[PDB]
Design an enzyme around this catalytic site. Sequence first.
Site, PDB file in Angstrom:
ATOM      1  N   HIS A 106       5.651   7.011   6.363  1.00 16.53           N
ATOM      2  CA  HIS A 106       5.301   6.514   5.019  1.00 16.53           C
ATOM      3  C   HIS A 106       4.772   7.545   4.350  1.00 16.53           C
ATOM      4  CE1 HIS A 106       1.735   6.285   7.214  1.00 16.53           C
ATOM      5  NE2 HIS A 106       1.093   6.647   6.144  1.00 16.53           N
ATOM      6  N   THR A 163      -6.149   6.902   7.833  1.00 17.72           N
ATOM      7  CA  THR A 163      -6.384   6.791   6.741  1.00 17.72           C
ATOM      8  C   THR A 163      -6.495   5.730   5.624  1.00 17.72           C
ATOM      9  OG1 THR A 163      -4.467   7.635   5.565  1.00 17.72           O
ATOM     10  CG2 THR A 163      -5.721   9.401   6.602  1.00 17.72           C
ATOM     11  N   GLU A 197      -3.338  13.315   0.653  1.00 19.87           N
ATOM     12  CA  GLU A 197      -4.601  13.145   1.484  1.00 19.87           C
ATOM     13  C   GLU A 197      -5.231  14.458   1.911  1.00 19.87           C
ATOM     14  OE1 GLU A 197      -3.547   9.342   3.895  1.00 19.87           O
ATOM     15  OE2 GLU A 197      -4.386   8.338   2.330  1.00 19.87           O
ATOM     16  N   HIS A 222       0.837  -1.187  -0.126  1.00 15.09           N
ATOM     17  CA  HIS A 222       0.148  -0.137   0.124  1.00 15.09           C
ATOM     18  C   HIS A 222       0.854   1.338   0.005  1.00 15.09           C
ATOM     19  CE1 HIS A 222      -3.099  -2.986   0.992  1.00 15.09           C
ATOM     20  NE2 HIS A 222      -2.401  -3.181   2.073  1.00 15.09           N
ATOM     21  N   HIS A 225       3.461  10.925   6.402  1.00 16.23           N
ATOM     22  CA  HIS A 225       2.852  10.726   7.549  1.00 16.23           C
ATOM     23  C   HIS A 225       4.035  10.141   8.660  1.00 16.23           C
ATOM     24  CE1 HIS A 225      -1.409  10.518   5.673  1.00 16.23           C
ATOM     25  NE2 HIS A 225      -0.817  11.745   5.686  1.00 16.23           N
ATOM     26  N   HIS A 240       1.960   9.131   0.626  1.00 16.02           N
ATOM     27  CA  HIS A 240       0.966   8.776  -0.143  1.00 16.02           C
ATOM     28  C   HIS A 240       1.325   9.812  -1.235  1.00 16.02           C
ATOM     29  CE1 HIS A 240      -1.423   6.922   2.952  1.00 16.02           C
ATOM     30  NE2 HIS A 240      -0.923   7.890   3.711  1.00 16.02           N
TER      31      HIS A 240
END
Length: 257
Positions: A91, A195, A103, A61, A116, A93
């Site tokens: 990590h 999230t 996000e 992910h 994050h 996104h």
Amino acid sequence: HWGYGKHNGPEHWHKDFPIAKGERQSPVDIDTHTAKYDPSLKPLSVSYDQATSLRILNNGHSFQVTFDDSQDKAVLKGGPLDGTYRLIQFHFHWGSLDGQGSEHTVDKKKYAAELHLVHWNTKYGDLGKAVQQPDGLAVLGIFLKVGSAKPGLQKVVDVLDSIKTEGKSADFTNFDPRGLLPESLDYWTYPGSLTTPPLLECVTWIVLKEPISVSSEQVLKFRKLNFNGEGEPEELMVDNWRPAQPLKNRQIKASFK
Ligand SMILES: CCN[C@H]1C[C@H](C)S(=O)(=O)c2sc(S(N)(=O)=O)cc21
Ligand SMILES: [Zn+2]
């Protein structure tokens, strides 16, 4: 089973995780004109000088860098928080192109990516216990825009070719996460959630106002990662972000005027 694709993405998550439609879900749009400056909010205290990184890992992910959280080494305190929160992992996104990937959004503006840094409240003893509590986690969110390179991100970039597919990991010791921070620690804060599934409502979100800039070459390296495992049809790990969720009965507070 969950993911970011058409058939398993954010619109599907509620079926296995009904709290997806809950009262304090994340991320959210930060409306800068509605957020209230709160002079009672303290400066953030980021104490990362003793941070001990362990491994870097593709989890299907995102990719994450994990830290030793078995004592008070890398901790977040102050700001909106009471007590001490230990850094467990960070990590990102990111998007398929530079105009999406974050996000959280700021006045509906999307950034190219979002970092994050995940911390858990030491009064609960471990991460698994912390995620079951409304004040269990503090996640420090940092926006990435594309421009000049971020020198402190380069060691991460350098090694992504070794964790291309789901399940791969590598040694990643002696990484200093301070090199990922912007100059200012001015922030917005609100009560929210993880999230990704299980989407637990256990997070005090602290989102920094100042983005860091990363280079096109750096974010291109992110986009070469794979959602799939080795030997499976190649599906680029891109657009691993959840869209903004309804704010509902919540106030976002700003630490700055
Ligand atoms: C793969 C799902 N991970 C979940 C559960 C883990 C226990 S975690 O480390 O608490 C964490 S932090 C975030 S995020 N995107 O809100 O910052 C999602 C998750
Ligand atoms: Zn995240």
